[PDB]
Design a protein around this ligand. Structure first.
Ligand SMILES: *[C@@](O)(CC(N)=O)C(=O)CC/C=C/C/C=C/C
Ligand SMILES: *[C@@](O)(CC(N)=O)C(=O)CC/C=C/C/C=C/C
Ligand SMILES: [Cl-]
Ligand code: NA
Ligand code: NA
Ligand code: NA
Lengths: 415, 416
């Protein structure tokens, strides 16, 4: 018995990010080096050492659905549904009864409905268990983003949700890519979503000192900079439509590019500390390269994990050098987190969009805020300004707590 | 040039913690003897909830399996996953050396992860302030920490993931790990589901949803397919299996319980909690798994059903079996082990995959206990009360979850 190996193309993009309430706004702001970082308004910033966050700007859920529908969705689900409908509309895909069992959904979330859980548990403690919402359980579960997307779209195919901390979006896309490659779906609506700007998330990330305590939004998120002191938390959703090539061509779909490689490894080291020298991340990049059937020298641009944390940025630099050798100083590396902040489970989704758009548009987005170069972080980070360049291959990296490492490789579409 | 043959995937090890026993042998032997793991709730004070019964682990002490130093930073869901995964690897007699470590992966899911940790830590936040929240709060709570902690405990450096799909969690995680090995991305996968849902918010949440049985009698509370079924009885635990590429298993002289041959996944695209009318989505997922296995539906001998003891789910699952199997539906055996273990949520698929694999190896079908009033709408052969000795070639395991997830696995008797 032999494996089916279908070609998988990107036919639609949808997004909500601190840089815009659609792909066009997000992409244009990213290539112009616009920061989505400002003072915290979502929660009371006085209680936490962290004073800045990357929030959605002027997002009103009622512009997309009824108040009654929105009331039964946590922010993480609202973002996923809005971005998925945006991606399908962009793909110009008509999900009929005929194709519905061949159209699936694979969207992840790092934590799901944390705000709902906090509000509902606070109701339990002060008002008693009978006052708990009949919809608390489905609203909270991370897989409800996939569930609500499938209902909104009429998508009846492969239906799943990957939860792998900050590697969530990258793994979800990789998993959906594998579904199409083996012929188990013709279309997959995939990516990540996150609404982590909550009391427990700010308390939790302050307790483990992962968050930047820099009160200046102009210098808070500075990946690879000598003075980096933790990440700046963001929110949103990045959803893409993956499609089997012949299916896309037959319907006259527009093609942004092709997904060719996916790598997944575990550090098997520590619950929160990444492996020394980023060895696991190096292995995940190598698996994705082997999956794509290319030489490492073929990678033109790396959309780095680059969170603006001491260890991660240093280890990611080391991992790139291990994988690419002499080609490491020849490629371009950039972290869009310098502008969007860290979207956690949605990071991989938004960064896959930027990686795909980098190939289609031939523009590398920059890493902003690098003022003090770090001798340990000496690669080409495309500082301050976007670079116009024809790209053939783009690599996107992610990692998460529990030692998860995930890598995706995108390729310029050629017939 | 690239490789293209599908690898054959065998089950080489089993590990479990369930309300029926703190290992596979105890759980299996109690299940085949129709022993109930359901009793009054002791985990939380149940006086405020309408639900009065649960299926808890019996005399489980995490310190019998690991040092206190290791257990302290683990929520119960992670403790269960680590203990069951170590048991599965020990049973598989697998030596994870530095050489094979990048070829040994982990794919374990949890429906909710560290809910108890989240509740305790949020209660600390409200009464003591955010500066008193633990630096271990975030990693302890996240559902993927079961995979994370299992990989650290084992030294497993390969494909590392976590599927979260409500009650379909365990089934999807196993199916996903099976696909990893089939495409040649790992030689070994430690996979399954884990859950510790016996918490304040879980009892309150499922009571508010009216998903839980409010029957105070532990003797009749969980009764799948019975006319008087009135919601599920919550359980806890972990079911972990070692999946392995066939040639790798044969070369090391591994014992083989059976083979994984089929996996189906669909979405109802209907409602947040209610399953589709006539269980159409579940019927499609069974059909996808059957096609994946390359068999005729008549080849299925036994169905380990989702059978949660809820009105719509048991009725719709019965309808879905009739749609898929036709005239063969009344010829096959169907049973719900949830009648004994209760509903393990994210761990249900893991424990039920173990029972399905053991059903083939031992040639014994576990029964559905507590069926006293037959429902005219649920008229299939549910193997009532007593286990059935039968040679099985193919076993199908079904799962479904909130959000319209449907997941199916097919296991086969191993033949060279
Ligand atoms: C992420 O892995 C951080 C990193 N190393 O880049 C991470 O911790 C995300 C975990 C998901 C968190 C959602 C919020 C929880 C309170
Ligand atoms: C499960 O899907 C119910 C079913 N239809 O069988 C389910 O609700 C589990 C989702 C929750 C998992 C753990 C959450 C506890 C609060
Ligand atoms: Cl934990
Ligand atoms: Na997570
Ligand atoms: Na065991
Ligand atoms: Na529990």
């Amino acid at each position: 018995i032999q494996m089916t190996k279908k070609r998988v193309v990107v036919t639609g993009l949808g997004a909500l990010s601190p840089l815009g309430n659609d792909v066009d706004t997000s992409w244009n702001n990213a290539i112009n080096g616009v920061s989505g970082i400002g003072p915290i308004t979502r929660v009371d910033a006085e209680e936490y050492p962290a004073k800045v966050a990357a929030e959605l700007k002027d997002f009103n859920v009622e512009d997309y659905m009824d108040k009654k529908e929105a009331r039964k969705m946590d922010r993480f689900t609202q973002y996923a549904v809005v971005a998925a409908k945006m991606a399908v509309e962009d793909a110009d895909l008509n999900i009929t009864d005929e194709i519905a069992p061949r159209v699936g959904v694979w969207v992840g979330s790092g934590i799901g409905g944390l705000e709902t859980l906090e509000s509902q548990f606070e109701i339990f403690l002060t008002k008693g268990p009978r006052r708990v919402s009949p919809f608390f359980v489905p609203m909270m579960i991370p897989d409800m983003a996939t569930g609500q997307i499938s209902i909104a779209l009429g998508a009846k195919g492969v239906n799943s949700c990957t939860v792998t901390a900050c590697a969530t979006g990258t793994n979800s896309i990789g998993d959906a890519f594998k579904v199409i490659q083996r012929g188990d779906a013709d279309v997959m609506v995939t990516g990540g979503t996150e609404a982590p700007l909550t009391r427990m998330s700010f308390a939790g990330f302050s307790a483990n000192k992962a968050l930047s305590t820099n009160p200046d939004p102009k210098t808070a998120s500075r990946p690879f900079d000598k003075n980096r002191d933790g990440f700046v938390m963001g929110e949103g959703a990045g959803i893409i439509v993956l499609e089997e090539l012949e299916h896309a061509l037959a319907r006259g779909a527009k093609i942004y590019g092709e997904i060719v490689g996916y790598g997944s490894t575990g550090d098997a080291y520590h619950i929160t500390a990444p492996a020394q020298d980023g060895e696991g991340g190096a292995r995940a990049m190598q698996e994705a390269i082997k999956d794509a059937g290319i030489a490492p020298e073929e990678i033109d641009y790396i959309n780095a994990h680059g969170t603006s944390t001491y260890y991660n940025d240093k280890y990611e630099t080391m991992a790139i050098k291990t994988v690419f050798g002499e080609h490491a100083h020849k490629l371009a590396v950039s972290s869009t987190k310098s502008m969007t902040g860290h979207l956690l489970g949605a990071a991989g989704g938004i960064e896959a969009i930027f990686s795909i758009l980098a190939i289609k548009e031939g523009v590398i987005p920059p890493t902003i805020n690098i003022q003090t170069p770090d001798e340990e972080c000496d690669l080409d980070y495309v500082p301050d300004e976007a670079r116009r360049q024809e790209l053939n291959y783009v690599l996107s990296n992610s990692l998460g707590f529990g030692g998860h490492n995930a890598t995706l490789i995108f390729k310029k579409y050629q017939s």
